Design an enzyme around this catalytic site. Structure first.
Site, short mmCIF file in Angstrom:
data_model
loop_
_atom_site.label_atom_id
_atom_site.label_comp_id
_atom_site.label_asym_id
_atom_site.label_seq_id
_atom_site.Cartn_x
_atom_site.Cartn_y
_atom_site.Cartn_z
N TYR B 27 0.75 -1.26 0.00
CA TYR B 27 0.00 0.00 0.00
C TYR B 27 0.78 1.31 0.00
CZ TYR B 27 -4.01 -2.95 0.46
OH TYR B 27 -5.00 -3.87 0.20
N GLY B 29 2.87 4.19 -1.40
CA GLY B 29 3.28 4.82 -2.64
C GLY B 29 2.51 4.39 -3.86
N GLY B 31 -0.65 1.96 -3.33
CA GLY B 31 -1.84 1.26 -2.81
C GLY B 31 -2.67 0.38 -3.72
N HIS B 47 -3.94 5.36 5.33
CA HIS B 47 -3.75 6.63 4.66
C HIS B 47 -4.48 6.64 3.32
CE1 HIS B 47 -1.21 9.65 2.40
NE2 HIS B 47 -1.55 10.34 3.47
N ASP B 48 -4.43 5.52 2.60
CA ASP B 48 -5.16 5.40 1.34
C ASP B 48 -6.67 5.53 1.60
OD1 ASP B 48 -2.73 4.93 0.05
OD2 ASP B 48 -3.03 2.83 -0.26
N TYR B 51 -7.54 9.21 2.31
CA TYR B 51 -7.67 9.97 1.08
C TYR B 51 -8.97 9.57 0.37
CZ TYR B 51 -2.91 11.98 0.87
OH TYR B 51 -1.74 12.68 1.05
N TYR B 64 -1.36 22.34 2.05
CA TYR B 64 -1.91 22.75 3.33
C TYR B 64 -0.76 23.35 4.15
CZ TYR B 64 0.07 18.15 4.35
OH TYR B 64 0.92 17.07 4.45
N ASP B 89 -2.43 13.11 6.42
CA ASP B 89 -0.98 13.03 6.32
C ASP B 89 -0.34 13.00 7.71
OD1 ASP B 89 -1.36 13.10 3.59
OD2 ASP B 89 -0.27 14.95 3.24
#
Lengths: 4, 121
Positions: B27, B29, B31, B47-48, B51, B64, B89
């Protein structure tokens, strides 16, 4: 790139 | 943005996002599928998913702002998308730090065919  | 996430990762762990996390396990870089290989890979899985919670945001490019309050990451107020991307993040960077103790170089450049099956967020 893709999905995250 | 991806570049900001990379800087956050380096700050947190002392590892360069590329290549330490850009091609790790199933997953990180890039996923998609399979059972995450270890705790670090699970950071990327979550994290995937994070998002994935933001289909009308653009986390690769949208920038951000954040600051450090004695060690801690504090996401500063931007657009709703920016705030949410920053929280995703931040969580991943903390997760990588929490799991540095198991990080394994053998999972760098992990081959796609060893990642099979969908795992629901």
């Amino acid at each position: 790139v893709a999905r995250s | 943005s991806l570049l900001e996430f990379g800087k956050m990762i380096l700050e947190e762990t002392g590892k360069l996002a590329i290549p330490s996390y850009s091609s790790y396990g199933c997953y990180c870089g890039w996923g998609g599928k399979g059972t995450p290989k270890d705790a670090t890979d699970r950071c990327c899985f979550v994290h995937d998913c994070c998002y994935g919670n933001l289909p009308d945001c653009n986390p690769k490019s949208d920038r951000y702002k954040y600051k450090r309050v004695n060690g801690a990451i504090v996401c500063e107020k931007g657009t709703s998308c920016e705030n949410r991307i920053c929280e995703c993040d931040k969580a991943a960077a903390i997760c990588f730090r929490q799991n540095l103790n198991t990080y394994s170089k053998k999972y760098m450049l992990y081959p796609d065919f060893l990642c099979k099956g969908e795992l629901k967020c």
